[PDB]
Design a protein around this ligand. Sequence first.
Ligand code: NA
Length: 101
Amino acid sequence: MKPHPWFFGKIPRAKAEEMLSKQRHDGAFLIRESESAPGDFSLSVKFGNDVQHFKVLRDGAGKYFLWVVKFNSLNELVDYHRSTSVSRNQQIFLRDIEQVP
Ligand code: NA
């Protein structure tokens, strides 16, 4: 298929904020590899004039989750949260970034 447009590797938290702050649509997001917690992933998401960040948590077996529902891949967790909100305070659905192209 195609590589996913949402995996940014080891981009600093502040550079994820810089990039997402130029996005127009709420829910534009990326997965990055945390610098403060090496070996952990973080999800950064545009919402309004902000950028929210969430830890990608692991269970004892290595499944990934944000809150309660967990998955066998980052790819399945991202796809799940295209239609189930990532936030408990707003309805925020992941959508791909509109890329410089
Ligand atoms: Na993680």
